[PDB]
Amino acid sequence: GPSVFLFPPKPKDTLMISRTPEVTCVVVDVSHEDPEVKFNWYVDGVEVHNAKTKPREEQYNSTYRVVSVLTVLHQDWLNGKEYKCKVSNKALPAPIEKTISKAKGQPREPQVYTLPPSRDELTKNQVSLTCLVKGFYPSDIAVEWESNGQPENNYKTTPPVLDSDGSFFLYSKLTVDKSRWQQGNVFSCSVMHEALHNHYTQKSLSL
Amino acid sequence: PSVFLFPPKPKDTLMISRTPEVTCVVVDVSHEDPEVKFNWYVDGVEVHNAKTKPREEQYNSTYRVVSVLTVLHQDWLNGKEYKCKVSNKALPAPIEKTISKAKGQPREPQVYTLPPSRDELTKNQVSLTCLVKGFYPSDIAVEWESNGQPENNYKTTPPVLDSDGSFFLYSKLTVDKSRWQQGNVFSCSVMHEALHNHYTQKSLSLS
Ligand SMILES: *[C@@H]1O[C@H](CO[C@H]2O[C@@H](C)[C@@H](O)[C@@H](O)[C@@H]2O)[C@@H](O[C@@H]2O[C@H](CO)[C@@H](O[C@@H]3O[C@H](CO[C@H]4O[C@H](CO)[C@@H](O)[C@H](O)[C@@H]4O[C@@H]4O[C@H](CO)[C@@H](O[C@@H]5O[C@H](CO)[C@H](O)[C@H](O)[C@H]5O)[C@H](O)[C@H]4NC(C)=O)[C@@H](O)[C@H](O[C@H]4O[C@H](CO)[C@@H](O)[C@H](O[C@@H]5O[C@H](CO)[C@@H](O)[C@H](O)[C@H]5NC(C)=O)[C@@H]4O)[C@@H]3O)[C@H](O)[C@H]2NC(C)=O)[C@H](O)[C@H]1NC(C)=O
Ligand SMILES: *[C@@H]1O[C@H](CO[C@@H]2O[C@@H](C)[C@@H](O)[C@@H](O)[C@@H]2O)[C@@H](O[C@@H]2O[C@H](CO)[C@@H](O[C@@H]3O[C@H](CO[C@H]4O[C@H](CO)[C@@H](O)[C@H](O)[C@@H]4O[C@@H]4O[C@H](CO)[C@@H](O)[C@H](O)[C@H]4NC(C)=O)[C@@H](O)[C@H](O[C@H]4O[C@H](CO)[C@@H](O)[C@H](O)[C@@H]4O)[C@@H]3O)[C@H](O)[C@H]2NC(C)=O)[C@H](O)[C@H]1NC(C)=O
C-alpha cells in the first residue's frame, strides 16, 4: 500500500526571483509486485505537463521510491494556486491524490523590533540579542542575523506561533560574546516576508 | 486501532496540588469489535489505578477509548517508565507503548524580562517579552501576572533546542500603551524542577 507525501517550496524560494520554487511529490512503500507509477499533476484543476520525474530508487526495505518535482511560478504561489499530485499504481484500488498551496488569508506586514539584552544578562559570559517579528500572515517567513554585512550563525529561530489576532509571531535569539556587545557594535535582524516592500526589511540594534 | 501515549502536563508535576494523569489513547476503534482492554505496567510491575473513560462517537464512524492513570509527582520526576497495553479481537498482538521523562541533568533556567522597542511606542499597544533559556528538560510552564492577578493576554512560544543542548523559549504579553506608561509592574512566572521551590519570577516596569 503506497503512500504519497507532498511538500511546499521553501519560504525564501518565492520571495525573490533569484531562486526557483519547487513542489516535490514523493511515493514510498511501492510494492515489488507492481512497481509502475504514473504522475498526474494539476494546478487549479487543469492538468500541467512540465513535471520532471526522476527514476525509481529501491530503498533498503525492498520498497521503491519515485519522486516527481514541478517548478512553480513565484507569483502563482503567492496568488494561492492549488497544486495537485495524482499517483496511480496497480496495487492501489483508487489513485492517491494530494493537494497543497499557500495558506489562505490576506497578507499582513510584519513588525520588526530589536530588543537590547536584559540588565541581568550583562554579568554572564554571553549576551542574548532578541528580534521580535509579529503580525505577519502567513507563517512562511525567514529571519537572519548579520553584522557589518557578515552573517551571524549562533542564532535559533522559534517556530511561528499563532497569535491571538489570527496572525503569527516568532522570536529569533542571537547569542554573542559579552566583549563584542560592549564595544558599541551594531547588529542587524534581517526579515524577508511577502508582505514587506521588496520582500525584505532589517533593523539595527546597538548599545 | 492506533495506540498513542502522552506525558503529564509540565505544570502538573511541579505542584503537589495537581494530578499528573498520564493518558493512553486508542483511536480507530473497531466498529463491530468491542471491549478494548487496558493494562498498565510501571517499570515492569503491573498497576491497576486506571480510569477508562467511556467512548465517544466520531464523524468518520471510528470511536475513541481513553484510559487515564494518575502517577506520583516524584515518580515521573525520577524517570519511572509507564507502559499501556491494549488488546482486542481485531488486534493479533498486544500492541504496547512506553513513555518516560527526558533523560539528562536538569539545568536552572534564566529568566529575563525585556521592554518593548522604542519603535513600538507609537502603536496602540506594547508587547512585553520574557526570555527563558538554558533549561532542561523541555517540560516547563510560563505564566504572566500583574499585581497579584493573572494577565492572560499572552502567547508562549514552544521550546527550542539551543546550541548547547539546553532549551529556550519566549512569552509575549500584550498590554495597552496607557498601562505601561503609568509604571505598572508586570511579573513573568516560570516553573521548572531545576528552580528552588519549582518557581521563580522577574518583574518589569517603566523606569
Ligand atoms: C477518523 O477520525 C479519528 C478521530 O478524529 C480526529 O482526527 C484528527 C485528525 C482531528 O481532526 C480531530 O479533530 C478528530 O477528532 C482519527 O483518529 C486520529 O488518528 C490520528 C492518526 O495519526 C491521530 O493523530 C496523531 O495524533 C498525535 C497527537 O495527537 C494529540 O495532539 C494533536 C495536536 O498535536 C491533536 O490531534 C490532539 O490534541 C491530540 O491530543 C493530545 O494528547 C493528549 C490527549 O489524550 C493531551 O495530553 C493530555 O491532556 C490531558 C488534559 O486533560 C491531561 O492533562 C493529560 O495529563 C495529558 O497527557 C494533549 O494535550 C493533546 N493535545 C496536544 C496539543 O498534545 C500526533 O502526535 C501523531 O503524529 C505522530 O504520530 C505518527 C504516527 O505514530 C508519527 O509519525 C509521529 O509520532 C512520533 O513522532 C516522534 C517525532 O519525534 C517520534 O520520536 C516518535 O517515535 C513517534 N511515535 C512513535 C509511536 O513512534 C508523529 O509525530 C498523529 O498525528 C489522532 O490523534 C487521532 N484522533 C484523536 C482524536 O486522537 C482517524 O485517523 C480518522 N480516520 C480513520 C480512518 O479512522
Ligand atoms: C521503507 O523505507 C522508506 C524509506 O525510508 C528510508 O529507508 C529506510 C530503510 C530507513 O533507512 C529510513 O531512515 C529512510 O528514510 C520509508 O519511507 C518513509 O515513509 C515514512 C512514512 O511511513 C515517511 O514519513 C513521512 O515524512 C514526512 C517528511 O519527510 C521529509 O522529511 C524527513 C525528515 O523529517 C526526511 O527524512 C524525508 O526524507 C523527507 O525529506 C523531505 O524531502 C522533500 C523532497 O525530497 C524536501 O522538500 C523536504 O525539505 C525534506 N524534508 C526535510 C525535513 O528536509 C512527514 O511530513 C510525514 O508526516 C506527515 O504525515 C503523517 C501521516 O502520514 C502525519 O502523522 C504527520 O503529522 C505529518 O502530517 C511522514 O512522517 C518518510 O519520509 C519516508 N522516508 C523517506 C526517505 O522519504 C517507508 O515508510 C518504508 N516502508 C516500510 C513498509 O518499511
Curated annotation (Swiss-Prot), chain A:
Stretch list, region Constant (C) domain: 1-207
Mutagenesis or variant effect for residue 199 to R: Enhanced ability to activate the classical complement pathway
Subcellular location: Secreted; Cell membrane
Result for mutant: residue 197 to A: Impaired ability to activate the classical complement pathway
Glycan attachment sites: 61
Disulfide bridge positions per record: 25-85, 131-189
Domain spans labelled Ig-like: 2-101, 110-206
Subunit structure: Immunoglobulins are composed of two identical heavy chains and two identical light chains; disulfide-linked.
Main function: Immunoglobulins, also known as antibodies, are membrane-bound or secreted glycoproteins produced by B lymphocytes. In the recognition phase of humoral immunity, the membrane-bound immunoglobulins serve as receptors which, upon binding of a specific antigen, trigger the clonal expansion and differentiation of B lymphocytes into immunoglobulins-secreting plasma cells. Secreted immunoglobulins mediate the effector phase of humoral immunity, which results in the elimination of bound antigens.
Protein name: Immunoglobulin gamma-1 heavy chain
